[PDB]
């Protein structure tokens, strides 16, 4: 007689994963699906990263004297450091966030000088709070107009848009601290600024009052913006307290954005940028930060998610035995194989078809459901330094909802994939056993432990024929029937 | 002896679907789950669709002379064309989108005239920029008040809400271009308009300055609105630059909305409306547009999603009968599973109705168990913009993108899971039929290894029919079968 | 000979669930996953709940005389009743919702009095619309300044923030009804109020005009707020129509919120609070309300969702029979068992291993994918008493999208879990049958009804050995072979 057994490989060190029906189960191999670390650096390729050392985007746009190196710059991502500061005339911007977001999304600081004509007033006003070297200065992109002689005539100028692109204009209004200062600068006792197009209008009345000292000034300047479509026209009408523009900014559409971070910039290649630094995007999920730019993994709350890439791990108990509650640590060539006890001796081989089928099924399984990468460039703000109320609450609620939903999706997907992997491996083993049983019609009996008891003389050639699939039962039919009964 | 085989049908041309464990597998039949085309026309039933033609909703509400045909109109969906224009006094509306959404959601333009008394001022002002035929005119729902004689007395009027429904009032403020114009129209050198109720107030100070010429006017008019609850009182106080209302609009709660489109309107029936036109809602997902009205399929990014309907398609081997082991039967058209028998009388074929019916019943109605039939949404947020604004527009775009991504992922996962379960159930049905057939023959037959049984006794057509029916009795063949086997 | 059967238990009354491949299937046991009822009361533990009674949060903060009991109060959840009313000077708050949300999220009403100096004006103004007992009064936290003698000097005061926490200041502007009233109260014909810090500024110009009578007054007061960071300074500049503050509120960060409800408050323990009342949080989903505070189940549209707990329910048909299309209602000591017919007599036993395995797999099944509870404290508003436009539409859209997505998730999860439960129970039964068949090598053959017939004499000891797994086929092989052939 002879003995033939079927079994599967095993490893000394397994990994614990989670499935639908099992809290913990050990498998031969697994991979991590969550990226939870960063190098702390921001790669300068392939995106064009612009580093604002001590300047905010708004200050660079306005023309702060210590931000003059940023003139006519372009970027894919603008990085704002926490050590940035303002060193010019004090100012405030109503709807600061909207202007900052639109400027960042434009992605360029291209400025074109236009020939504005201001008759009856003095131009190029300066202050000691904004020093350009040893002399008083001002924002390079703004014009401060004051009285000439002893009069401030009413200003009424126009400028049409004859190009094929939109124009962005930045202008301002001056708020004096005292009535005497207001009358000294502008002869009128109450100024007025009106800027309008064929479809929109804005009018600001300056406010007079004391304010906390900032770099020796108790006055302030408010900043406003206007966009002129092609074929439209811009009209500026003012009675005083006007901070005139010097030109327009060319506004574009693209995939530029802005980020707050303190990480240094190095020479490397990475497609994902986070405030903590660049991270690889070879995993579907990440746990570093919910603020991202480029092709990045989705953010989830979990810090680890193991995906099974192997079969169940079962130790070998201490006469050969099959796969019934028994693994084989001696199999190196494949995942499934045959162990036979013969008159010549004990042998062992491996089956390539079932192993290849299992490997092909397992490989690239996660790519069938989830997308490879998602590219997001400009999004909403997710961190705030001041309390505002309704809009901030809405933004926080939206972000929280998105994070929770994606975390649930990731958990469910991992559990389902692990369960299906275990099921497919078990099914492959059972299919191999059933095929082996079908090959031997009545010359063998099931020993009950994953092994077959062949009742005729089966040499090495016979075992090889069984493994190949060319076993002929009619040859040994009579001998096996005689031996069994 | 005799031979009995079990197998399943196959088709000459199959469809390729995607499962959890397989990226490309061929099945006998599949159906498309994504609607990706439209007729290009908007059906006028069962929803009431109002064509705006060359008028916007705000212009129609205000009373533009060329929009006078829209007085006291009702709609379920208001369609705005891209060729609409304004032909009256130039104006601007602070928070234009909010007022547009409010009017669209109200769903009606019902106007009730009220008896307002304005003492000491002239009424029914007109301009050459708003012509009512050959003569000067103005907005039909607004009253322009100017000085009478040489004085403009302070106006102080009241109007109580004695009804049981809310009132919507539309009023305005005039912005002169020059100080001389302001003094000429109204005696005071600085106007002031105050409209308030018991719980809210609004005050506007007009601005004087030149503006680009629009239809011969360098002045502008601002538009404001106020809502008066039942039992409340409206008080209007002004001393210049007031564009008085003539009445109130009835405001209702319903399922009306507004849509921007250029598609023509035709006579047909459709429950879903998109800017591209109407689309059928028989499929759970669509790819036409993310802007929808009515009972519409959910929007996804995928162009196509095939749901498996039949079994795995296996070609017939060209080579003695064979079973279902890696071989399909091309000659079966009366069922999904059947028997092929080789006998002394001759060969034959049949079909098993029970297993086929069970598989069909399991497959039928499969997607309705998870996905709800259809979702009905009427008024939503705006999803396309023509100007850059900043924070709010970014938030709206982010919300829409998040929703679209989540629904696309859900659709992909659902399709993969359903295909996998369909394949598994079909294979299980085939295996169960084979196991039952084996269980019927206790010791008179043995498995041949290729999905066929070798019966070791003379089994005529009646015996085969008894096997197929399930009334086979092995006792009266047992002796002969055991004698033949050994 | 002897007969051995394998089967599973059944119950007289079952329940219907839904699976992936079945519209309706009856199981032996199921549990409800959706909470759809409440006791109508709000439990006062463990959260600190403050009853607003007939006062609103804004009125309590301002210092309404009938809300004086709320001074220096703390809360985790503030409950606003629909019967609340105002009984002081008429007022309006621009961006009322933002201030309400800010105060609610702060979670305290701690007030610190500061020594402001107002030179040349009279303080502690009062009105008949706000009665402090028999005499005229005003808001306790606000100071009404009017002319002294026949002059109203320009006011210019400062207050620095030398602490290490943020300060919140509440101030106001008075709107007279007539020019004569404006002149009588304040000498100047046009007032002006300017409040600013080193980084922000606000200027309000009062408006004069008649307004509807409210408690005998045709005038109004507009409320504004300002926040001063540590190291900053507050400057107040005005020349009329100023409602001065008396101090600052301590603003904190925490998990406090506000709710609108009419349910009474009783003494009990509950972690979840809804406007309908408190609900238990032992279920993953709830259908009571979409407004929640604390550890609450997720809100879904469905009102019922049944999760399978037992196996399929098959009534027993009317010579023992196995599990093939037949259940056993007489078995109560286990889920799976054996029935044998013997010469000595019939019997019945239960198998504990398979039952324990099935119970362990079923137990804690839902905890493998979904979390126990999610804690949410402060969120967006979800019900509105008036129409506003864009922001309200955005909030409603966000809430609707979240609800729809979570409902879909719940439905799919329930269907998948039910399908897997049915599959695992069937697999357990089939595995037990296969093991029993494997034990009997050649001494028995399946008769097709889930039972085995044994061709040798098998007494109670032999049946017990078969159940235990110690059955030896070699002892009876010869007798069984002789009987079979
Ligand atoms: C309405 O009320 C506000 C607030 O009370 C007033 O604003 C103050 O205005 C005064 C000037 O009028 C300001 O005083 C100035 O402060 C400067 C900054 O002080 C800081 O830095 C110095 C030096 O580093 C420190 O010693 C000091 O502690 C602060 O940390 C000083 O640099 C100025 O000095 C100048 O004047 C002195 C006068 O002796 C000279 O000796 C100096 O050389 C130099 O020329 C000056 O002291 C004060 O800071 C303002 N306060 C605020 C909060 O802004 C308004 O003036 C008031 N309006 C009216 C109309 O009354
Ligand atoms: C502050 O600054 C603004 C901007 O510069 C000034 O606004 C301009 O005002 C003038 C009038 O004061 C406007 O000129 C008028 O333009 C009308 C439209 O012009 C278009 O159409 C004509 C014909 O189709 C074209 O030829 C032309 O190129 C334009 O395409 C004209 O129809 C008007 O014609 C009137 O005057 C002529 C003079 O000969 C008469 O013959 C006519 O019958 C008719 O009465 C007129 O020419 C100009 O368009 C305004 N510009 C803008 C941008 O709005 C403010 O006036 C200024 N304010 C102060 C106080 O100085
Ligand atoms: C601009 O226009 C507005 C609106 O028309 C005017 O506002 C009105 O002003 C008058 C004058 O004060 C107000 O009249 C007062 O109404 C009080 C409330 O009335 C209600 O309550 C009483 C008692 O419950 C009811 O009987 C009554 O029907 C109302 O339901 C009264 O209590 C006042 O009575 C006082 O005056 C009378 C005069 O004889 C005395 O006998 C009384 O004892 C008491 O002293 C008074 O009648 C009216 O309510 C205001 N209406 C609104 C809507 O606000 C502005 O005055 C006007 N501005 C200018 C400059 O003209
Ligand atoms: C455009 C212009 O007029 N620039 C002035 C500037 C303005 O007058 C002022 O800053 C507007 O608020 O003032 C400069 O001087 C400041 C200086 O002025 C004296 O009159 C005053 O006595 C000093 O205390 C001090 O404020 C400035 O450098 O800011 C001069 C500049 O030309
Ligand atoms: C209600 C009223 O007064 N309507 C007037 C209107 C207004 O005076 C004006 O539009 C307010 O801005 O003006 C109308 O004439 C415009 C006409 O006025 C002359 O005085 C001027 O010299 C011309 O150039 C021209 O602007 C108009 O039709 O708009 C007359 C109308 O009665
Ligand atoms: C701070 C102050 O001046 N309080 C007054 C208050 C104000 O004058 C008024 O409310 C501002 O609008 O008015 C009080 O009197 C109300 C009373 O005043 C008479 O002059 C008038 O003729 C009456 O009709 C009536 O309005 C008030 O109690 O509100 C007095 C208070 O001292
Ligand atoms: C990436 O940077 C963020 C900074 O926003 C880190 O998040 C903070 O971590 C600290 C320390 O645990 C917490 O006190 C803060 O509350 C966190 N902030 C937020 C907004 O969550 C994050 O830990 C960093 N991650 C890595 C991997 O470095
Ligand atoms: C339905 O109409 C929309 C119009 O918004 C079409 O979307 C545009 O398609 C063109 C052509 O590919 C693109 O260039 C635009 O960028 C698309 N716009 C947006 C907002 O996506 C859409 O293709 C139409 N669909 C059908 C089936 O006709
Ligand atoms: C819990 O309270 C809410 C209050 O909003 C109830 O919801 C309302 O129920 C009534 C009665 O059917 C409806 O007419 C309203 O339209 C509902 N409002 C909303 C916003 O849905 C809810 O039914 C209560 N639930 C329980 C279990 O008491
Ligand atoms: C485990 O799987 C990973 C990825 O599938 C593979 O790179 C690795 O070699 C595997 N480990 C072993 C021991 O085969
Ligand atoms: C394929 O399925 C669809 C619907 O499921 C059905 O209408 C069609 O007839 C099927 N195809 C065949 C060849 O039966
Ligand atoms: C049904 O299941 C629940 C929870 O698993 C359990 O409490 C209950 O006792 C079960 N019913 C029966 C009859 O065992």
Author numbering:
A (entry chain A), C (entry chain B): 12 to 329, 336 to 502
B (entry chain C): 12 to 330, 336 to 502
What does the literature reporting this entry say, word for word?
We find that the human-infecting H3N8 HA has a dual receptor-binding property with a preference for binding to avian receptor, and the G228S substitution slightly increased binding to human receptor. We then solve the structures of the H3N8 HA protein in complex with the human receptor or the avian receptor, and identified the structural basis of H3N8 infection in humans.
Next, we solved the apo structure of the HN/4-10 H3N8 HA by X-ray, and the complex structures with avian or human receptor analogs [LS-tetrasaccharide a (LSTa) and LS-tetrasaccharide c (LSTc)] by cryo-electron microscopy (cryo-EM). Nevertheless, both structures formed conserved hydrogen bonds with SIA-1 at residues G135/S136/S137/E190/Q226. Notably, residue S228 in the S228 protein formed two weak hydrogen bonds (bond length 3.6 Å) with LSTc, whereas the interactions were notably absent in G228. These results suggested that the G228S substitution to some extent enhances the binding ability of the H3N8 HA protein to the human receptor, which is consistent with our SPR results. We examined the RBS structures of S228 and G228 HA variants after binding to the human receptor analog LSTc. The RBS structures of S228 and G228 HAs were highly similar, with the S228 RBS being slightly larger than the G228 RBS. However, a significant difference was observed in the orientation of the sugar ring, where the C1-C2 atoms of the G228 GAL-2 were rotated outward by about 40° compared to the S228, resulting in its GAL-2 being about 3.9 Å further away from the 190-helix than the S228. In general, for human-receptor-binding H3, the distance of the 220 Loop from the 130 Loop of HN/4-10 H3N8 S228 fell within the middle range. The HA of the S228 H3N8 variant shows a stronger adaptation for binding to human receptors compared to the G228 variant.
